[PDB]
């Protein structure tokens, strides 16, 4: 079917309330010094050492 | 017109009051290049730029004053003469 | 599905060419009407 009626920018902005992404969930590698993704290898120069 | 090799005086502009020799002439647009007038800086080297021929006035050979030029026929040819005095210029 | 235009050089020049239009009397009028408009292609 077709929308019976136009959508306000209040209804639209409400419905985009939960449309987002989250922070990548990252730790700090204790060899590279830099940041990394937990349970993944250090994308910088380094390894896993798990 | 104003042919080059002529000593003129700048009647208008921000160089007004100076005076120099005509170097180049662009008579399709009525522009003349004076020496030491309209120094421009381009990307950094510095040159002269053209100025409209309406703005420079010729100097009287007698009293060093800016005048107009007229034409006479001393012979079977033309001669330019100043308006203040009457001497060929 | 066979469509309406099948290109062909001989038929195109034998029906709409300059000589075909300059052959009849209402083709000379088509050329005289396309020259007045300023069209850059009189016959093809």
């Amino acid at each position: 079917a077709v929308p019976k009626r136009r959508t306000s920018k209040t209804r639209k902005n409400k419905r985009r309330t939960h449309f987002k992404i989250s922070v990548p969930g990252m730790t700090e590698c204790p060899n590279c010094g830099e940041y990394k993704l937990s349970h993944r290898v250090c994308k910088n120069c380094g390894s896993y050492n798990g | 017109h104003i042919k080059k090799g002529d000593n003129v005086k700048v009647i208008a502009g921000k160089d007004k009051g100076k005076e120099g020799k005509v170097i180049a002439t662009l008579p399709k647009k009525d522009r003349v290049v004076v020496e030491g007038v309209n120094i421009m800086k381009k990307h950094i080297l510095e040159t002269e730029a053209a100025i409209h021929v309406s703005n420079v006035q010729l100097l009287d050979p007698k009293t060093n004053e800016p005048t107009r030029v007229g034409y006479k026929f001393v012979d079977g040819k033309k001669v330019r003469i100043a308006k203040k005095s009457g001497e060929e210029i | 599905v066979k469509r309406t235009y099948q290109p062909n050089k001989r038929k195109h020049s034998k029906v709409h060419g300059f000589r075909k239009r300059m052959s009849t009397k209402n083709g000379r009028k088509v050329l005289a009407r396309r020259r007045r408009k300023g069209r850059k292609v009189l016959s093809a």
Binding site: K20, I21, S22, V23, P24, M26, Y35, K36, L37, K43 | - | -
Partner: protein, 111 residues
């Protein structure tokens, strides 16, 4: 002081860039860099290059320390769209807007 850097007519729709600009607005500088490095989104490298540019103007253009800066502003405006088409069934043809965006980032040392 504040330093700023812009990237104009980036060829990504603006409401796809505003999704990842909202994760790094407010954070520190070295934290926002790692966030932009470790995210799946296609607009991550562009924002990362704009952020590194605004972090590099600070060291040279107006001298300041790059271990104190925080992302004070980060936003994306519209730019000129491109108008393409897509030929659909029964002779019709629908439009296609190729959006662009202008990404601005302002880093401040809090002073």
């Amino acid at each position: 002081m504040e330093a700023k850097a812009v990237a104009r007519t980036i060829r990504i729709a603006p409401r796809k860039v505003r999704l990842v600009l909202d994760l790094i607005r407010g954070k520190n500088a070295a934290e926002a860099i790692a966030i932009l490095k470790l995210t799946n989104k296609a607009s991550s490298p562009v924002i990362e290059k704009v952020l590194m540019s605004a972090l590099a103007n600070a060291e040279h253009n107006y001298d300041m320390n790059t271990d104190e800066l925080v992302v004070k502003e980060a936003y994306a405006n519209e730019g000129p769209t491109l108008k393409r088409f897509r030929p659909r069934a029964q002779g019709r043809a629908s439009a296609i807007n190729k959006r662009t965006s202008h990404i601005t980032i302002v880093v401040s040392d809090a002073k």
